[PDB]
Amino acid sequence: IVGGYTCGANTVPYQVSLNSGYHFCGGSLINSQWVVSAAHCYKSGIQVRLGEDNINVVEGNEQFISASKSIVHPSYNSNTLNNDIMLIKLKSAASLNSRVASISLPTSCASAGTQCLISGWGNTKSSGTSYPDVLKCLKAPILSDSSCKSAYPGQITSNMFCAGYLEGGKDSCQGDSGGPVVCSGKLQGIVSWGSGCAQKNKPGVYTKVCNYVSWIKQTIASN
Length: 223
Ligand SMILES: NCc1ccccc1
Ligand SMILES: [Ca+2]
Ligand SMILES: [Cl-]
Prior knowledge:
Layout: E1 5-6, E2 15-19, E3 23-31, E4 34-37, E5 47-50, E6 63-72, E7 86-90, E8 115-120, E9 136-141, H1 145-151, E10 160-163, E11 180-183, E12 186-193, E13 204-208, H2 213-221
Antiparallel strand pairs: 1-9, 2-3, 2-5, 3-4, 4-7, 5-6, 6-7, 8-9, 8-11, 10-13, 11-12, 12-13
Bound molecules: benzylamine, calcium ion and chloride ion.
């Protein structure tokens, strides 16, 4: 997260860290045994880390659970990043409490202008590399489809939306991928891609979760 602020220990209870010897992507807990993340975060040997704040120190409240299965959307395209969504099933159910809780799936899509909370342990610098120890937060509005498509001509599909600031300075970045975009208590987006980080006229692009609610529920129901 570039231009964000320290969230505060366990203030984003649904945030998860995907780990394989190091943090490589974020995710969101949607129920005691399932996590939603980005398809481009897929890899084998994933350990899901819940209740995390400082990812480099065991502080208490953490729950480490191996992924039993990762389900990349069958229509995921790695070149266009369309359908950039993945479901991860935990080997065992997480213990839900005030520090580890699930986030609700949307019943409807969010409109432009809606303020959302984006979080992650991604890069905090636009020009350079600097990874934080503690979870960073960022409040950012969903942009109009017109502005989004003008920023990325011919690259925005109906399954994506832009969020952030056109003047640059605040954005999601590498390492934040797969993380949550929560608006009004509902998971509306998944950190997916963009051109650089916090650059002028190049807002972050996110997977539009409201288009996948039926797919998520039907997939979870059969696994
Ligand atoms: N600034 C958007 C973004 C998100 C994840 C990775 C790279 C860039
Ligand atoms: Ca920790
Ligand atoms: Cl059905």
